[PDB]
Amino acid sequence: GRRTLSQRKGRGSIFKSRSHHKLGVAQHRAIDFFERHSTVRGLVKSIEHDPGRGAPLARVVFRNPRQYGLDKELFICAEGLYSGQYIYCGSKASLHIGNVLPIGQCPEGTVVCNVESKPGDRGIIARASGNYATVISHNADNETTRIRLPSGAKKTLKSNCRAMVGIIAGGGRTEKPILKAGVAYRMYKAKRTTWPRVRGVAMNPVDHPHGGGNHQHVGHPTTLKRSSPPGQKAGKVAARRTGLIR
RNA sequence: UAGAAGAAGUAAAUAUGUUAGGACCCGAAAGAUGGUGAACUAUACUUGAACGGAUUGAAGCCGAUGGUGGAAGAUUCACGCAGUGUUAACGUGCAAAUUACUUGUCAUAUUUGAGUAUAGGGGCGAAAGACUCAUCGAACUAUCUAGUAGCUGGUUCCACCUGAAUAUUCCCUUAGGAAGGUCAAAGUAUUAAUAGUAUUGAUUGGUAAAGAUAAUGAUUAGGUGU
RNA sequence: AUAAACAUACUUUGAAUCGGCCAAGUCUGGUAAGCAGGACUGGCGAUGCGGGAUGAACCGAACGUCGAGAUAAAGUGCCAAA
RNA sequence: AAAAUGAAGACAUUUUAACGAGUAAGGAAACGAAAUGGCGUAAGGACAACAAAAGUAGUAAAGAUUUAAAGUAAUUUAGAUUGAAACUGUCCUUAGUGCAGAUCUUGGUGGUAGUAGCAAAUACUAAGAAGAGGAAAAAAACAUCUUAGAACUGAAGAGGAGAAAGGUUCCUAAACAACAUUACUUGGAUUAGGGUGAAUCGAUCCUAAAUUACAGAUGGAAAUCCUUAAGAAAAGGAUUGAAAGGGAAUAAGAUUAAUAGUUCUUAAUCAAGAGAAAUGGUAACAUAUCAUGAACUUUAAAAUGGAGUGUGAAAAUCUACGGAAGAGUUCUCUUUUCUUCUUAACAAAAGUAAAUUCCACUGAAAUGAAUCAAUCAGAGAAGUGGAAUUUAUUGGCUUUGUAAGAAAUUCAAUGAAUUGUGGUAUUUUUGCAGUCUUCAUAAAAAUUAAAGGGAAUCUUUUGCUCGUACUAAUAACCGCAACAGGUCUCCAAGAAGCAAAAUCUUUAGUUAAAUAGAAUAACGCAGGUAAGGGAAGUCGGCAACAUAGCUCUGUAAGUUAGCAAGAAAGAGUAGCUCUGGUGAUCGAAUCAGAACUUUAAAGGUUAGGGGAAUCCGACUGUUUAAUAAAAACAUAGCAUUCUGAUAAAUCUAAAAGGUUCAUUACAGAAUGUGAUUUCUGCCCAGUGCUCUGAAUGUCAAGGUAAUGAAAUUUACUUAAGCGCGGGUUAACGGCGAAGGUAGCCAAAUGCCUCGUCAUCUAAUUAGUGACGCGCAUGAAUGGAUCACCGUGAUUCCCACUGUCCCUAUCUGCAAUCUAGUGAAACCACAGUCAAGGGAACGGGCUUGAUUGGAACGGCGGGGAAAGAAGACCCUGUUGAGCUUGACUCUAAUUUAUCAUGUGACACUCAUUUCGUUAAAUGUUAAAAAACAUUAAAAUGAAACAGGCGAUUGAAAGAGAUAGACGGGGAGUUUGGCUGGGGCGGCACAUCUGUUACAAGAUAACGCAGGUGUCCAAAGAUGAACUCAAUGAGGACAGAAACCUCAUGUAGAAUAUAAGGGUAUAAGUUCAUUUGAUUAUUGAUUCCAGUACAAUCAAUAACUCUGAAAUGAUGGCCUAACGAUCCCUAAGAUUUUUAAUUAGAAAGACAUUUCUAGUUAAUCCUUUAAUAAUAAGGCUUGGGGUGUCAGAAAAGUUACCACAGGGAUAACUGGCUUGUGGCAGCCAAGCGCUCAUAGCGACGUUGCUUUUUGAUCCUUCGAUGUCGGCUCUUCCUAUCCAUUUCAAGCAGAAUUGAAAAAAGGUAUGAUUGUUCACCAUUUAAUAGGGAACGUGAGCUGGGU
RNA sequence: CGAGAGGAACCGUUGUGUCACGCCACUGGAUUAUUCAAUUAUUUGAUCAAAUAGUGUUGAGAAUCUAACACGUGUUGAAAU
RNA sequence: CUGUUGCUUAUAGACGAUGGCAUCAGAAAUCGGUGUUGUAAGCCUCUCGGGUAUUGAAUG
């Protein structure tokens, strides 16, 4: 047989990211002394639209802690941020929307975003539109805190992991019904090559494991093991349940 | 049941037969290995170029239902492009896919140049096994390679002599082989080593015929007795 | 009884072949077949010649090149010898 | 063959006799009485004038062509002509040694054949010139150049230029052999020269997508990875990447045969060089350099989508006023029609704009301001007065310098004349202003300017390298070419119109672009028309007709309320003469109305046919380049699955490797259904998937222990997986684990079927609406529903028409003929028929009919015409694509063990994943979008740690081994016989009776059956007895219970199929027993005289039975079964050796033999010798191959391929004729009586090839496979008309039959249909054949 | 003929349809005599006269060709069956 | 005698062929007759005008 489209996607030739007009990498500033033991102030100069992502990006300008000059940053904008606003990053930062604090300084029940998974790694979790994580509980015995990920899973992180207080702006993006195939075509302008998806049943046996015969049907169960080799792992993998749940 | 029983072998040049090699000559679809191709086409990115005229009339806005407004992967015409029909022309063509008319489409899922990226059990595919330089249900090129072929075709001077076969056994055997029969050529033996014939003599067989209150089986009728 | 010395017995080595088909005072399956399959023999294949007008197999008869004669199958109105 | 003769004769001896066909095949050479005889080609060794010049040859070699002779023939010999330098004869040796074929290879050449053709692109004509080249009884045509006429492309061009590509094709002169389908004096062709000029245009420079280095990482290798991360490399990161992106700076005129933002004239511009730091204005801000401004930092520019509206300016077009100059028309007018009236870069600043944004004064409500639209205002409107910027260079337009001295248009013969002013018009270009739109927000760098800071104190020179010619296409490019194909752009006049549409014209280009003339046949290709009828044609309205612009009136059901809609339907439209409406302080085409006239008006060109239903897909979109444009794909919507990022998916041999990911669940990855509305029923048994679970059901390498001298052996313990249990069907799936729910239906789904009933028509296999036990509908395999949409499928109306009744006719180009030029396919030889036979459909053969030689135009009957080693079918022990618990494996994934960090879980120290400019680690001491740096001062600014800061962690990754899983992938296989193959069967190993023919052998998918077993007795033996059945008797007892006598040839039994055999037995009963054993021979059956297997006859043991003779090496006989290799069992003491006692005889200064006693070892080998284990040998059995002389083996190809086959199927033909059809004989009866007017049962005899079978003879290097249309001919078994006879014939209408095939035999609805069935009409509407007539005749509905 | 109901035939006359052969008088069709006239667009300064739109279009339209659309002939005799 | 040739020949015709004439031949205009259209151009009237008319029509 041939190689399925899922296999051809891993070589990354026409499936590379269309990341030419992107603003840059959106993350916190590199952790230094002035943010471990003090606070720095950053000015929100502008709010921009990063191609390929649904949330706006903020161009924050911190002055400098040690040398003369500027430190131009690029944050993921929290909902409620405005141009000309002063935001603060540091351990002693106040509990306001848009500030970046260590996760241990946030009281239980605080709503944060752009949380770090590992301290000093400049943000991992809760970065898509309208997404956030909630602080569940703290643990000073081992300097760890528990947060609730946007998928509902609970994660235990170091208490000095950093996060920004508030909601990621742009919520409700997916609640608007795409109506035209053209609109879906433009949605992937600054994304990968994935959109027009040919069903496996509509292919031939060489192209896909679903490539059927005289009637368009799969023919074998669509739930497969995780240990299935690439090229046969088509359908639902390690499906605990299946069907319209009740 | 091999051997011995006053040794017969060996060498080399030919012919014939068997065998292996390109193997009497030409013939596959295939397989593998190493390279070359995205000047055609498929998709994607970078940077450029290309919307003239009508129809219709959504929000929003003004007035006392009338205006305004100009939206829409809205309707159409043109420049272009395609290829629905004629199953027209042509069909040793203008053309290894074109021409004419009719038809459709004719800017946002649009059209298009150049640059660039993806390569053969691979790529790319709005999916037809489509396209990947007139080559694709696995490109092109060179080597292994004069691949193998129980199958098809051909196989070159004269006179003379002899002259067949379609049984039997075994086979993954049924378009083919080996044992064997028929045939030829060489080489012997004085040779208990002649007969596709008849006669006489002693046999063998169960066919044609014959039989059917002779055994087995089938079958029409008539007397006589109980 | 008859025949048989270029009789008889062979030995070695080897070729080709084992798709067969036809006839009938024969047989089986079949309604039957220029059908399928057999027993014995003669043929065609491998074979020309004379005759059946023509014909692989019928009939006569098998072949070095010729001359003269008697013939075979079968023929004798003409084509066509009688 | 036999005799005779035989050293050399000669003809391979003499005589005699017999004999002589031949495919496949054989007969090598030598062999005196020759074990076949010879011819030819080339080369090698010899021989070739015997007396010391020794084969032939310039007194003519080889070769070629013919003429004769010899030979049965292969061939040889000689002559003549041609040819001029080598060659030949004989014997041996050697071979790249003899051609008619191979779709053979290479080359050359015919017929076709002077044939098909040189027919798209509207078109040429007259005079003259040049030239060999328009002659001539018209030889009707004549290439190039000029002029005149007539025309075409029609400014989205057949115009003027570029990019790529080409490469000298550019220009000129000479010259025309070849080339451009005639010709050429022409040419993109031949020859020779000439031609491309840059500081300002480009390349060069910058970066984009991307690309490539050193060091490093990875790999067995080649090499791969990394591109700033890994580095003592590069203030921060290397190379390349655009002649369309970014970019310092040049214009006008003239000039050349050709180059020109490049040369010349004039006039410019740019870059790089040389000669205690200013004012003005309230402010926005402004001042021919002025008026300093370093490190460092910041900002801006370069530099950013699209739509639509309004508007400023320029240009073009049009037009008003005033002319100057020239040209056109002019006996008819026209103060007329036409042409020119221009001006650059770079700068200046008389006069004067539009738009936007800011500044000052004042403070708006009775709210105002304004736009086409909007939009705006106390974080301040309007007003007044100002500042700035944009408007194709300075500063937008006029104007000015350049600069009229140029150029344009004229006039004279170089010299003179002119070169105003406007427009509330259209289009293009270029800006601007706000509006809208995105789940799209629509480059970077080189490089430039400014700011914050306050460190320090006009003239002139040069401007390098490379490209620059020409085409850019109906002839310069890519397609074999001067190919009707394809190939990216720039500029862009008039009329008319909504229009860049069609049509015509101007500037420019061209009249040549594969030759023409005459004629005016058929048949064509392209374009038309048509009486009356109007789809009756046809599979089907295919094709054609028809509708068509604009204005007004009007517009239905349905509907997702948006549409349907240009629904449908109706009226108007011309010309001329007028009037009115729409503005500014003269002008725009637009609208409305009114008279009158006519050929009554959109129609030259352009320019929708409409309606009523059904099916499918929701829609816009995409698709099989070259037979499928769709109902297929996509789509949005819906739904499911996994994943916390060190992850999921996934590329890679590996990798500080790669992709989604510059990402983070509103995300990434994998899927199904396919808008909306309504609804998604029941099932967890099976296969998947999953579990937060199961221990001692089964599980590997390992680890532990025991024995042994050790290998070995044994026991125990070990993971995932499988098994058990729970969940899951918008998982695969099923719906009598649960029995099809809601719905839907003869459906694109229903065989029967042309289902039944309505309706549509005169007529309905079609359509629609109902019905539903539905072969075989049904719910995200999605069920039902359908508004709008569709180059989708289907049916019916109206309208229209050559589709048709039924054809006629007109035009152009061909075809015809001619001049010039000039192919190809195909070709065994060829070319009149009938019948026969033949390979069963002859051009050739046999017999007849018949024939005059050469051919022109047509034509499609034949040449089973050409094209292609059939693609359908079958066979190969031939493949390939795809599938799957087919067989055997494999990547990926997964689990267990091993691989040594410390301290007793804790730590870090290898290891993992990260982050930064390795930038304060560890221990001590939310008012404000502003600035923040190069320090004063006398250290400021704290010390130390052996950790750059975190995270993970002795776990995990990679390696090795072991188990699981693994069509993701690799390799391969997928029996045979066979009235084609498959399905079936086994005729595959096997036994009996029969076919089967009285020896043996012996066929069919012939007939009736059987085997893969059964038996410690059913084997062996001895003895006794007689069986089945019947008759007659005996309590219950009877037709059958048991007893007795008699008869009883087997009619019983004998394991079984059948056939044989058997009576003091081979059957029954009783008794003993294990011969159903070991060893050695020789035969018979099958047979190749192989094996296995079976059948015997003997011999040596040891036994059994019997008194004994005997009998017994399985079964009463004929079936009841199995090689090599491998595994596994049993057997090899009968005897031979050695050592030491006792005795004896031979043996050179030891040692063997014989005899008895003893003790030990003993089937052979593991090769230096032994030992105990282990293994290997030898003989004989078992384990088994049933395809039974014995591979280890699933499908599907309609995507298919190859070698072949008429050894073999699908069509014709041929034999047959069961079946189909037709016709007879007899006569029981029917026919009121009456066998025969008309019938005719029970039987029986034929004919036909118009049915379907049966067969496999021809065709597999191909005979185009249904029907219809068209057209001819033939048969008669006659439907009509003509002539007759009979009747249960009164007439009429009919019925049966004879002569007779010369003439007729129809139109339609449904269906592809042949057929069928209906509605008509007719004198009748008969049946059939001709390769199931007829495809280089059509059509393509069926297949 | 027949009870009736119904119900013929020969001779003679007159037509029609089809097939065959023709034919252009009458009637109809085609029409590039681009014949004559009208008219749309473009270009000839205007009139006239034209040309172009490959036959611009329309009305009438001779000739020639032709009708299934016009119209003639094949009603024709002897002998043997 | 026949053929060629001429009448850009017809009663014929793809080309041949066939038919006619060939110096009293043929061709040509012009005129008359005969048709078609519809009333020309210059100034409703001139005007039943003008135009065409064998090309495959009929006289002279």
What determination technique applies here?
cryo-EM
User: Which residues make up the interface with nucleic strand B when CB must lie under 7 A?
Assistant: A 1-3, 5, 7-8, 11, 13-16, 18, 20-21, 179-183, 185-186, 189, 193, 196, 198, 202-208
CA A47 to chain centre: 19
- Cα(A181)–Cα(A177) distance, rounded to whole angstroms? 12
Resolution (A): 2.8
Q: CA dihedral in degrees (A197, A240, A204, A201; nearest 10)?
A: -60
**In the structure, how far is the CA atom of residue A85 from the C1' atom of nucleotide F22, in angstroms?**
125
**In the structure, how far is the CA atom of residue A171 from the C1' atom of nucleotide B64, in angstroms?**
45
**In the structure, how far is the CA atom of residue A26 from the C1' atom of nucleotide C19, in angstroms?**
88
- Cα(A63)–Cα(A80) distance, rounded to whole angstroms? 23
Q: Which nucleotide is nearest to A21 (CA to C1')?
A: D443
Q: Which two tokens stand for residue A26?
A: 């959106």
Determine the residue type at A55.
A
Q: Which of A244, A241, A235, A191 is nearest to A210 (CA)?
A: A235
Q: Which of A79, A48, A74 is nearest to A62 (CA)?
A: A74
